[PDB]
Amino acid sequence: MAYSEKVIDHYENPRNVGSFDNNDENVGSGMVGAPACGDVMKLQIKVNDEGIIEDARFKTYGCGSAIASSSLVTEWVKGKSLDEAQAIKNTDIAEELELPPVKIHCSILAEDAIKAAIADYKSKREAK
Numbered sequence: 001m002a003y004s005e006k007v008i009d010h011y012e013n014p015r016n017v018g019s020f021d022n023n024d025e026n027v028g029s030g031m032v033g034a035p036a037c038g039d040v041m042k043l044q045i046k047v048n049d050e051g052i053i054e055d056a057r058f059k060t061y062g063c064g065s066a067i068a069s070s071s072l073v074t075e076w077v078k079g080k081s082l083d084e085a086q087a088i089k090n091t092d093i094a095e096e097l098e099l100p101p102v103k104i105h106c107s108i109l110a111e112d113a114i115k116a117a118i119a120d121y122k123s124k125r126e127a128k
Helices: 090-097 105-124
Strands: 042-047 053-059
Antiparallel strands (some): 042 053
16 A cells, blocks of 8 residues: 565575675675684674774684574674774673683684774775
């Protein structure tokens, strides 16, 4: 009557790639490995013209039956600014996610992925 029927989306390209719609020019590149002979974590962000984080993305080894795992950071940085995301503290994501001391290292590897994505962005747009 008053409302129309927009275009529904479904079955379009893969997912869990670790990037928000291809790799823009304002996207941050970060690569932090675990405290050992492994390294398999990834975290990329998307900065807008205002120099603020508009989108967020990450990647990990995986396993199965996880359903949105370690995707708590992608929401934290989202809507925030690089200057703010740089103030993030492992203890925060570690105290909010709730985990044992044995898997505490996973709380530190997160922060690293933050700064990187930041210093990486301004590094690609530092051309003046």
